[PDB]
């Protein structure tokens, strides 16, 4: 992907995270589990629903469109009518197929960016209180309980609270 | 203790195409291309179509006797001709501006078939019973149900003249014919005059017709010809017919109502007790998708026809389960 | 000590739409859709249009006497017909290939109205003073200013023949008419011949006309009819008129110049002392924007007409002030 | 945004920075103030002016286009002429609206990328001589005067010059 | 010890344009716009075209004697008319529905020129040797190679009647003419009858022609006129000609085969011993590129014509060498 | 570029790397040299070949298309035929030029992203065992021989193997 997260440094997806597109898996002494990030997922759902409705809205309804008949001495007009019908069909099939291809590429990049930015949010919060261990995972240099897990998931990780403990374990 | 960031995966086998990559398996997707129809002819916005049965437009408008007679008044949302259409013009000739008349009928939503010149009172001095084997009915010679073959009476064909004033408040479609015998002996026998002529005039129509006598290759076993003409008589206007021979006079005319969204289609599908917003010659479409690949001919409010076989937008992610 | 990275914000309330998000407020934006016009008819590239006033094209070209006479020579950038156009053809009949003539006029930039057959010298043996109540002027019976109603003189209608050689170096548009009386008594009274005919020939035009006598519904209180015809006489060519009755002879013809970028529009807007590069029937557009939603009919160099109500490109950032 | 800077980890814009799209705010013992980054702003202005002119240039001038008249026996041709006029209008309204929507999305991503890359340039220069404090701000581990501020704004921050002082304050 | 990450650069001077930036130099690129042709007329899919030489379509179909006679049977992939085309209709007049006939010929892939009415057996009671200076050949008066000018024999022009039954299994194109003398003395001298007429009938064609006598401006030194007509005789049908004067009778007709992908072009290029899938009036295109800017007129399987001067996709990177 | 690598923090390209679009230059005691990253280059080649073929495939073959002739009394029809031919040509020239411009911008961003992600892969592997020295280069805090160079080029850099040696040299 353009942003390197999906199928990148995070190799695979989670079948166990059924409640959202992006989220977290944690493991501490009280257990483990999945937790979808509701804010980014809902924002992504809103934008994509917006994209799909825009594609539908941009295509007007096709009102009645039937053929016309021509006698044996109106061949030129019949061919002109066929050239018009063929040409419009050429352009609309071209427009529809390209738009889907272009928007499909952007949608996959959109999800890739959201995963990447989610990872960056956590990384900027933890600083050196934890270490990157690859595959989008961090190992804490301190005991990280459920309340501390939740502080990472929302915006409120208390870095100073654990710097002393983390500094000791870093060595 | 660890925390990991990740993304959704599932058992979806949906695939989409992108500019850089074909056949990408994705978690969620939406189809935009309608490819399903019900294979039936349905009411369109609550109005049943006009089915012509064994007749095409020409046969219905002239009143070919081999077609089941329609009710005096009909209203419809579209016209259906069958691909067979065994019955059209039965006495050979030219239908002048036939395609223009079909285009006119495409914006018509209703007709009233009424007697413009009643048979028993309009032509007291002419024979009105002429029939032909080319327009047979139940194995017997017959003629168009809407036209009258005027011929000489008691050895005389007096110069006729009849008019009609359109007091219907709607356009009245008037159809008539001109007969061209294959030889002058038949022309003199049928119409008693050799320099015969027909005149049809309204406030905006003015045409004169003259027989052109010649023997021709037989079509439906007829060396003669019958040319068919029409005009739209505006509300309040008058049409005057004048002839001393060869006129195939109108008997029934049509009072026409104008509508929107209609057209003529060809279909071998069957009428059913259904309702639709979108009708194609193959069947009806019940869909809100923006595109369809079923048929380029559509009646009503329909998705746009495209040639594509697949149009799928990805909404989810690339699906990478463990 | 600190250093921060940030981006511009301001008091802008401009909004744009994107694929993922509607109504995004942005710092800077550019409008691409022209929606303003001046509500006036203007000169186009320094040339004033041809306003027909109370006449349509037919009335002007035939010379309907109820329309203010134009100067002998005019040059223009477009033609304006008013929606009213009370004055067109005043004696009822058919204007053959009228729409083709209008299309011809759409690439014409200039005319010279000149006397092709002078009244007092062209027809010494015929009456040229015929007028009708259908073409009245100031409450008195009159006739087209460009045509002459030839009738019998001293009980005789000699076979006439007149020709014109186009030495103008430009196409000459010639108009004439054929009268169809409602009965043979009028035909014999006006033209003294019953098997009358009119012949008009040039190097590439060859047509014969014959009266078709019948009584018809009255139009503008006339049961007769007048069919109008035209041809473009190429430079150097000759046109020959031949008739023993029923000819409505040309008196004035037009020498036509061909131009580019012109057309015919319908407008109830007023001529003003302005200049424009782009004219619509609603008004003139002074703009360099690529799109406009004012009117699909345009003269000159104009933005492309689209149905959209808004087309705004963001140039700045998402506007997030504190 | 796709790159996570605008409306992302930098939550809001600066009304006080009137002279450019992207730039810096600094605070030291000699005072504080805004300073637009002239290079990135001017490069962005050039590219966007290029984008707008391309949209205008791709649309040719519409020369004279009027209607045509048809008699009562030319209904088929009149409907064909109307089908042609309607169809072209359908496509051009479709083209114009989609192009603006697509380019609008790209423009916002373009600015988002420029802010993100500007932040990365500063971050790569300072290394551990300063600390990320969120909202796109860095706090120096050493006295950073106006000349040192300017060295960050252009490409010439002297990391070795302050490493000793920064190392002491880091503890 | 160090490791660096970097990207490819080379000596390429290819430039492309993007939305944000013009004239970007790139390492690799692909051209999509075909601008090269060979300047020759070639065989299309292995079939040579039909070159008409000095004749246009009208001259070839009528058989203008100034054009090199073609072989009895020809098959082709497209028709070439030269821009000069000095030879078309040589006796002045109107070619009715000429443009429709050209459109018909555009889907024809083969002709067989055969004698429909042999000269020496079809008209024993009429003169068949009439020639004119307007259709001269080698400085001597001549006539169309496919038509016969019937005139009176021994002071008499008997009413003729001849027919042909199409047993070719293909459409047969039949051409004939109607002569209009400039005065009645010539009409009586050539055809002995003043109320002359011509009748042509098939199962779906029925038309009558009558001379219209008038003196006209001389065209190619002829004040008379010759109107040319045609019809397509369906397989198995019969055409009947009937006249007592003025008929320019058919001698040779064409059995026509229908094909696909053909058309008529104008070119001053030369036939060469080459083969192509794509032919333009300027030359042949040997290309798989999706676009070309050579000519909007194309025969065969061709790239799409666009007005652009350059269409280059970058495939590599921005080229920044040290 | 959108991702800041090409013409960004990596200022120039390598004429000496002839075998790929992206790759590495190394220098140790056994010498120096270039090495294209075969995986990313080949993946980029596949995607771009896919893009070019899609552009070609979306444009159908133009079958026979010639003009039509009209007599002096068919001016309206002749102008309608010309309006149809002109209008279709307008749209296709518009479609072709825009598509090339839009895809050209995306292609350059695509390469920029690949270089950026390649740099991030190496940076995430080395951690503090090496230092960023700008221009997309890293200087190792330990002796990095050819086998160790190759471990960076593929996915297998052994960070623990050199942490002790790197920690000593970091001071
Ligand atoms: C588009 O992608 C799908 C999924 O990647 C393709 O369908 C899958 O094709 C693979 C390989 O043909 C199948 O997997 C394995 O095939 C091997 C032999 O190649 C066999 O030994 C294994 O037992 C296994 O089946 C897989 O079943 C199949 N999945 C489906 C059909 O749901 C699909 O072919 C692709 N289309 C293209 C590339 O056009
Ligand atoms: C597009 O966005 C603009 C700006 O975000 C919208 O206009 C703004 O709408 C809000 C809410 O309607 C107004 O703000 C506040 O409204 C509350 C009640 O909702 C009221 O109590 C406050 O006093 C305050 O006015 C704001 O004034 C208004 N700004 C304008 C009109 O300039 C706009 O409605 C959006 N359009 C959409 C979503 O279609
Ligand atoms: C598109 O880009 C190319 C390459 O950047 C431009 O061609 C190059 O133009 C430069 C400047 O005109 C030439 O370089 C130097 O020019 C200076 C004077 O300006 C001269 O003193 C040096 O000796 C040197 O030649 C360079 O030769 C030339 N390269 C070519 C033609 O291959 C091109 O002009 C650009 N097109 C545009 C901006 O429309
Ligand atoms: C047919 N047509 C007329 C209509 C007109 C309206 N649109 S609409 O935009 F609503 N279509 C969509 C269809 C789909 Cl499947 C999606 C989507 O990916 N979801 C739905 C929301 O939960 C997402 C989710 C589930 C589980 C775990 C994580 C995420 C999956 C979206 Cl976002 C939009 C289609
Ligand atoms: C109407 N039409 C025919 C014409 C044809 C030519 N274009 S043109 O491309 F020049 N339009 C533009 C219109 C605008 Cl407002 C902008 C823009 O955002 N600016 C202008 C430059 O200072 C930017 C700025 C100001 C203050 C602080 C920070 C940044 C804001 C741009 Cl970049 C281009 C439009
Ligand atoms: C003409 N037309 C009908 C055809 C239909 C098929 N396509 S095709 O997609 F194959 N065209 C391409 C043309 C080109 Cl030059 C390229 C490209 O950049 N390369 C080729 C692969 O080694 C790349 C490379 C070389 C050296 C060092 C680093 C990288 C350079 C590509 Cl990727 C595709 C065009
Ligand atoms: C973010 O998550 C943290 C961690 O759970 C929340 O902080 C706790 O909030 C509850 C109730 O609000 C308090 O009883 C705890 O004392 C808080 N923990 C600490 C360490 O102060 C915080 O409320 C969450 N913020 C949200 C959801 O917006
Ligand atoms: C970048 O900013 C620095 C900091 O101001 C500039 O370095 C100073 O430049 C002036 C004049 O060029 C000298 O008098 C100072 O001694 C320089 N400072 C140091 C610490 O050497 C530098 O010139 C700027 N570079 C630009 C604008 O390209
Ligand atoms: C990645 O590169 C490393 C470094 O060369 C490779 O590891 C060596 O592989 C060879 C043969 O497989 C062994 O003899 C060496 O002992 C390995 N080195 C070490 C330190 O264990 C590795 O095989 C490469 N992986 C690939 C190419 O997939
Ligand atoms: C309708 O006609 C098509 C071919 O014209 C045929 O394939 C199809 O089976 C027919 N359907 C019915 C119901 O007759
Ligand atoms: C022009 O006509 C329209 C409707 O045809 C009307 O709404 C408008 O007011 C008129 N303008 C003038 C100036 O007469
Ligand atoms: C063909 O004609 C064009 C102009 O009509 C002329 O420029 C060109 O030289 C001619 N080519 C030949 C080979 O006669």
PDB file of C-alpha atoms in Angstrom, chain E residues 33-211:
ATOM      1  CA  UNK E  33      -0.044   8.723 -29.109  1.00  0.00           C
ATOM      2  CA  UNK E  34       0.587   7.382 -32.612  1.00  0.00           C
ATOM      3  CA  UNK E  35       1.797  10.116 -34.974  1.00  0.00           C
ATOM      4  CA  UNK E  36       3.564   8.121 -37.726  1.00  0.00           C
ATOM      5  CA  UNK E  37       2.100   6.772 -40.968  1.00  0.00           C
ATOM      6  CA  UNK E  38       3.620   5.415 -44.178  1.00  0.00           C
ATOM      7  CA  UNK E  39       2.021   7.876 -46.613  1.00  0.00           C
ATOM      8  CA  UNK E  40       0.668   5.079 -48.822  1.00  0.00           C
ATOM      9  CA  UNK E  41      -2.623   3.429 -49.688  1.00  0.00           C
ATOM     10  CA  UNK E  42      -2.412  -0.233 -48.669  1.00  0.00           C
ATOM     11  CA  UNK E  43      -4.429  -3.416 -48.677  1.00  0.00           C
ATOM     12  CA  UNK E  44      -6.705  -3.601 -45.634  1.00  0.00           C
ATOM     13  CA  UNK E  45      -6.717  -7.042 -43.977  1.00  0.00           C
ATOM     14  CA  UNK E  46      -5.409  -8.500 -47.226  1.00  0.00           C
ATOM     15  CA  UNK E  47      -7.948  -6.894 -49.591  1.00  0.00           C
ATOM     16  CA  UNK E  48      -7.083  -4.162 -52.068  1.00  0.00           C
ATOM     17  CA  UNK E  49      -9.335  -1.078 -52.262  1.00  0.00           C
ATOM     18  CA  UNK E  50     -11.483   0.076 -55.168  1.00  0.00           C
ATOM     19  CA  UNK E  51      -9.802   3.096 -56.765  1.00  0.00           C
ATOM     20  CA  UNK E  52     -12.139   5.137 -58.960  1.00  0.00           C
ATOM     21  CA  UNK E  53      -9.371   7.070 -60.724  1.00  0.00           C
ATOM     22  CA  UNK E  54     -10.727  10.122 -62.526  1.00  0.00           C
ATOM     23  CA  UNK E  55     -14.334   9.193 -61.639  1.00  0.00           C
ATOM     24  CA  UNK E  56     -16.397   9.919 -58.572  1.00  0.00           C
ATOM     25  CA  UNK E  57     -19.124   7.492 -57.471  1.00  0.00           C
ATOM     26  CA  UNK E  58     -21.666   8.998 -59.882  1.00  0.00           C
ATOM     27  CA  UNK E  59     -19.354   8.742 -62.884  1.00  0.00           C
ATOM     28  CA  UNK E  60     -18.436   5.132 -62.128  1.00  0.00           C
ATOM     29  CA  UNK E  61     -22.018   4.006 -61.514  1.00  0.00           C
ATOM     30  CA  UNK E  62     -23.403   5.695 -64.630  1.00  0.00           C
ATOM     31  CA  UNK E  63     -20.368   4.666 -66.682  1.00  0.00           C
ATOM     32  CA  UNK E  64     -18.882   7.999 -67.710  1.00  0.00           C
ATOM     33  CA  UNK E  65     -16.888   7.166 -70.875  1.00  0.00           C
ATOM     34  CA  UNK E  66     -13.906   9.327 -69.865  1.00  0.00           C
ATOM     35  CA  UNK E  67     -13.018   6.889 -67.053  1.00  0.00           C
ATOM     36  CA  UNK E  68     -10.995   3.719 -67.558  1.00  0.00           C
ATOM     37  CA  UNK E  69     -13.492   0.816 -67.643  1.00  0.00           C
ATOM     38  CA  UNK E  70     -13.313  -1.515 -64.657  1.00  0.00           C
ATOM     39  CA  UNK E  71     -13.234  -5.300 -64.743  1.00  0.00           C
ATOM     40  CA  UNK E  72     -16.664  -6.991 -64.677  1.00  0.00           C
ATOM     41  CA  UNK E  73     -16.281  -8.152 -61.049  1.00  0.00           C
ATOM     42  CA  UNK E  74     -14.438  -6.347 -58.251  1.00  0.00           C
ATOM     43  CA  UNK E  75     -14.136  -6.944 -54.509  1.00  0.00           C
ATOM     44  CA  UNK E  76     -12.608  -4.440 -52.110  1.00  0.00           C
ATOM     45  CA  UNK E  77     -12.148  -3.268 -48.529  1.00  0.00           C
ATOM     46  CA  UNK E  78     -12.668   0.478 -49.105  1.00  0.00           C
ATOM     47  CA  UNK E  79     -13.404   2.936 -51.917  1.00  0.00           C
ATOM     48  CA  UNK E  80     -11.032   5.763 -52.847  1.00  0.00           C
ATOM     49  CA  UNK E  81     -12.137   8.890 -54.698  1.00  0.00           C
ATOM     50  CA  UNK E  82      -9.526  11.301 -55.830  1.00  0.00           C
ATOM     51  CA  UNK E  83      -9.807  14.960 -54.759  1.00  0.00           C
ATOM     52  CA  UNK E  84      -9.794  15.994 -58.431  1.00  0.00           C
ATOM     53  CA  UNK E  85     -12.536  13.645 -59.714  1.00  0.00           C
ATOM     54  CA  UNK E  86     -12.883  15.497 -63.012  1.00  0.00           C
ATOM     55  CA  UNK E  87     -15.514  13.013 -64.250  1.00  0.00           C
ATOM     56  CA  UNK E  88     -18.952  12.629 -62.709  1.00  0.00           C
ATOM     57  CA  UNK E  89     -22.323  13.336 -64.283  1.00  0.00           C
ATOM     58  CA  UNK E  90     -21.616  14.642 -67.778  1.00  0.00           C
ATOM     59  CA  UNK E  91     -25.133  15.506 -68.987  1.00  0.00           C
ATOM     60  CA  UNK E  92     -26.472  18.103 -66.530  1.00  0.00           C
ATOM     61  CA  UNK E  93     -29.300  17.233 -64.188  1.00  0.00           C
ATOM     62  CA  UNK E  94     -30.251  15.954 -60.756  1.00  0.00           C
ATOM     63  CA  UNK E  95     -29.037  12.675 -59.233  1.00  0.00           C
ATOM     64  CA  UNK E  96     -31.948  11.813 -56.953  1.00  0.00           C
ATOM     65  CA  UNK E  97     -30.942  10.447 -53.530  1.00  0.00           C
ATOM     66  CA  UNK E  98     -27.279  10.450 -54.563  1.00  0.00           C
ATOM     67  CA  UNK E  99     -25.999  10.726 -50.990  1.00  0.00           C
ATOM     68  CA  UNK E 100     -28.229   7.833 -49.914  1.00  0.00           C
ATOM     69  CA  UNK E 101     -26.737   5.723 -52.712  1.00  0.00           C
ATOM     70  CA  UNK E 102     -23.222   6.569 -51.514  1.00  0.00           C
ATOM     71  CA  UNK E 103     -24.177   5.455 -48.007  1.00  0.00           C
ATOM     72  CA  UNK E 104     -25.485   2.208 -49.506  1.00  0.00           C
ATOM     73  CA  UNK E 105     -22.192   1.659 -51.351  1.00  0.00           C
ATOM     74  CA  UNK E 106     -20.298   2.105 -48.064  1.00  0.00           C
ATOM     75  CA  UNK E 107     -21.416  -1.351 -46.857  1.00  0.00           C
ATOM     76  CA  UNK E 108     -20.876  -3.018 -50.256  1.00  0.00           C
ATOM     77  CA  UNK E 109     -17.845  -5.290 -50.639  1.00  0.00           C
ATOM     78  CA  UNK E 110     -18.304  -6.518 -54.227  1.00  0.00           C
ATOM     79  CA  UNK E 111     -20.081  -5.785 -57.505  1.00  0.00           C
ATOM     80  CA  UNK E 112     -20.879  -7.738 -60.661  1.00  0.00           C
ATOM     81  CA  UNK E 113     -21.577  -5.535 -63.689  1.00  0.00           C
ATOM     82  CA  UNK E 114     -23.944  -7.434 -65.987  1.00  0.00           C
ATOM     83  CA  UNK E 115     -26.167  -6.577 -68.943  1.00  0.00           C
ATOM     84  CA  UNK E 116     -29.704  -6.254 -67.589  1.00  0.00           C
ATOM     85  CA  UNK E 117     -31.230  -5.180 -70.932  1.00  0.00           C
ATOM     86  CA  UNK E 118     -28.972  -6.237 -73.832  1.00  0.00           C
ATOM     87  CA  UNK E 119     -28.601  -3.494 -76.416  1.00  0.00           C
ATOM     88  CA  UNK E 120     -29.342  -5.465 -79.578  1.00  0.00           C
ATOM     89  CA  UNK E 121     -32.393  -7.425 -78.372  1.00  0.00           C
ATOM     90  CA  UNK E 122     -34.247  -5.245 -75.855  1.00  0.00           C
ATOM     91  CA  UNK E 123     -35.470  -2.340 -78.035  1.00  0.00           C
ATOM     92  CA  UNK E 124     -36.102  -3.525 -81.613  1.00  0.00           C
ATOM     93  CA  UNK E 125     -38.527  -0.650 -82.314  1.00  0.00           C
ATOM     94  CA  UNK E 126     -36.434   2.242 -80.942  1.00  0.00           C
ATOM     95  CA  UNK E 127     -33.189   4.009 -81.776  1.00  0.00           C
ATOM     96  CA  UNK E 128     -30.483   3.214 -79.212  1.00  0.00           C
ATOM     97  CA  UNK E 129     -27.495   5.107 -80.656  1.00  0.00           C
ATOM     98  CA  UNK E 130     -28.095   8.590 -79.205  1.00  0.00           C
ATOM     99  CA  UNK E 131     -24.949  10.391 -78.015  1.00  0.00           C
ATOM    100  CA  UNK E 132     -24.119  13.887 -76.788  1.00  0.00           C
ATOM    101  CA  UNK E 133     -21.147  16.243 -76.806  1.00  0.00           C
ATOM    102  CA  UNK E 134     -21.558  16.679 -73.042  1.00  0.00           C
ATOM    103  CA  UNK E 135     -20.321  13.090 -72.571  1.00  0.00           C
ATOM    104  CA  UNK E 136     -17.553  13.123 -75.176  1.00  0.00           C
ATOM    105  CA  UNK E 137     -14.843  10.459 -75.351  1.00  0.00           C
ATOM    106  CA  UNK E 138     -11.556  10.842 -77.254  1.00  0.00           C
ATOM    107  CA  UNK E 139     -12.928  14.064 -78.707  1.00  0.00           C
ATOM    108  CA  UNK E 140     -16.092  12.414 -80.045  1.00  0.00           C
ATOM    109  CA  UNK E 141     -19.669  12.585 -78.802  1.00  0.00           C
ATOM    110  CA  UNK E 142     -20.529   9.579 -76.644  1.00  0.00           C
ATOM    111  CA  UNK E 143     -22.819   8.466 -73.811  1.00  0.00           C
ATOM    112  CA  UNK E 144     -22.815   6.577 -70.527  1.00  0.00           C
ATOM    113  CA  UNK E 145     -21.523   3.023 -70.859  1.00  0.00           C
ATOM    114  CA  UNK E 146     -24.336   1.683 -68.636  1.00  0.00           C
ATOM    115  CA  UNK E 147     -27.302   3.604 -70.098  1.00  0.00           C
ATOM    116  CA  UNK E 148     -29.010   3.812 -73.491  1.00  0.00           C
ATOM    117  CA  UNK E 149     -30.609   6.935 -74.985  1.00  0.00           C
ATOM    118  CA  UNK E 150     -33.800   5.649 -76.600  1.00  0.00           C
ATOM    119  CA  UNK E 151     -35.296   7.859 -79.315  1.00  0.00           C
ATOM    120  CA  UNK E 152     -37.888   7.448 -82.055  1.00  0.00           C
ATOM    121  CA  UNK E 153     -37.321   4.956 -84.870  1.00  0.00           C
ATOM    122  CA  UNK E 154     -38.674   5.589 -88.384  1.00  0.00           C
ATOM    123  CA  UNK E 155     -40.699   8.529 -87.094  1.00  0.00           C
ATOM    124  CA  UNK E 156     -42.410   6.460 -84.383  1.00  0.00           C
ATOM    125  CA  UNK E 157     -41.747   5.909 -80.665  1.00  0.00           C
ATOM    126  CA  UNK E 158     -43.893   2.911 -79.672  1.00  0.00           C
ATOM    127  CA  UNK E 159     -44.848   2.469 -76.046  1.00  0.00           C
ATOM    128  CA  UNK E 160     -42.133   0.176 -74.721  1.00  0.00           C
ATOM    129  CA  UNK E 161     -42.221  -2.231 -71.804  1.00  0.00           C
ATOM    130  CA  UNK E 162     -39.384  -4.398 -70.490  1.00  0.00           C
ATOM    131  CA  UNK E 163     -38.839  -6.279 -67.249  1.00  0.00           C
ATOM    132  CA  UNK E 164     -36.067  -8.110 -65.425  1.00  0.00           C
ATOM    133  CA  UNK E 165     -36.314 -10.818 -62.765  1.00  0.00           C
ATOM    134  CA  UNK E 166     -33.440 -10.801 -60.269  1.00  0.00           C
ATOM    135  CA  UNK E 167     -32.105 -14.366 -60.280  1.00  0.00           C
ATOM    136  CA  UNK E 168     -28.677 -13.319 -58.968  1.00  0.00           C
ATOM    137  CA  UNK E 169     -29.322 -14.125 -55.308  1.00  0.00           C
ATOM    138  CA  UNK E 170     -27.991 -10.650 -54.493  1.00  0.00           C
ATOM    139  CA  UNK E 171     -29.355  -7.129 -54.524  1.00  0.00           C
ATOM    140  CA  UNK E 172     -29.272  -5.657 -58.029  1.00  0.00           C
ATOM    141  CA  UNK E 173     -28.731  -1.901 -58.297  1.00  0.00           C
ATOM    142  CA  UNK E 174     -30.577  -0.496 -61.320  1.00  0.00           C
ATOM    143  CA  UNK E 175     -29.934   3.008 -62.660  1.00  0.00           C
ATOM    144  CA  UNK E 176     -31.889   4.939 -65.290  1.00  0.00           C
ATOM    145  CA  UNK E 177     -32.491   8.501 -66.428  1.00  0.00           C
ATOM    146  CA  UNK E 178     -35.246  10.860 -67.530  1.00  0.00           C
ATOM    147  CA  UNK E 179     -34.496  13.438 -70.221  1.00  0.00           C
ATOM    148  CA  UNK E 180     -36.119  16.883 -70.151  1.00  0.00           C
ATOM    149  CA  UNK E 181     -35.726  18.676 -73.511  1.00  0.00           C
ATOM    150  CA  UNK E 182     -35.598  22.492 -73.506  1.00  0.00           C
ATOM    151  CA  UNK E 183     -38.508  22.906 -75.957  1.00  0.00           C
ATOM    152  CA  UNK E 184     -41.483  20.977 -77.313  1.00  0.00           C
ATOM    153  CA  UNK E 185     -40.054  20.836 -80.847  1.00  0.00           C
ATOM    154  CA  UNK E 186     -37.155  18.733 -79.554  1.00  0.00           C
ATOM    155  CA  UNK E 187     -39.531  16.648 -77.423  1.00  0.00           C
ATOM    156  CA  UNK E 188     -41.676  15.858 -80.462  1.00  0.00           C
ATOM    157  CA  UNK E 189     -38.614  15.193 -82.632  1.00  0.00           C
ATOM    158  CA  UNK E 190     -36.940  12.815 -80.170  1.00  0.00           C
ATOM    159  CA  UNK E 191     -39.954  10.980 -78.739  1.00  0.00           C
ATOM    160  CA  UNK E 192     -42.916  11.785 -81.051  1.00  0.00           C
ATOM    161  CA  UNK E 193     -45.246  12.152 -78.047  1.00  0.00           C
ATOM    162  CA  UNK E 194     -45.952  15.292 -76.031  1.00  0.00           C
ATOM    163  CA  UNK E 195     -47.799  13.752 -73.065  1.00  0.00           C
ATOM    164  CA  UNK E 196     -44.973  11.269 -72.576  1.00  0.00           C
ATOM    165  CA  UNK E 197     -44.379   9.387 -69.333  1.00  0.00           C
ATOM    166  CA  UNK E 198     -42.038   6.823 -67.786  1.00  0.00           C
ATOM    167  CA  UNK E 199     -43.097   4.193 -65.247  1.00  0.00           C
ATOM    168  CA  UNK E 200     -40.738   2.090 -63.117  1.00  0.00           C
ATOM    169  CA  UNK E 201     -42.240  -0.467 -60.725  1.00  0.00           C
ATOM    170  CA  UNK E 202     -40.997  -3.288 -58.499  1.00  0.00           C
ATOM    171  CA  UNK E 203     -42.548  -4.994 -55.474  1.00  0.00           C
ATOM    172  CA  UNK E 204     -41.534  -2.053 -53.244  1.00  0.00           C
ATOM    173  CA  UNK E 205     -40.783   0.778 -55.718  1.00  0.00           C
ATOM    174  CA  UNK E 206     -43.519   2.608 -57.626  1.00  0.00           C
ATOM    175  CA  UNK E 207     -42.794   5.902 -59.386  1.00  0.00           C
ATOM    176  CA  UNK E 208     -43.999   7.798 -62.460  1.00  0.00           C
ATOM    177  CA  UNK E 209     -42.009  10.453 -64.322  1.00  0.00           C
ATOM    178  CA  UNK E 210     -43.199  13.190 -66.676  1.00  0.00           C
ATOM    179  CA  UNK E 211     -41.114  15.594 -68.809  1.00  0.00           C
TER     180      UNK E 211
END
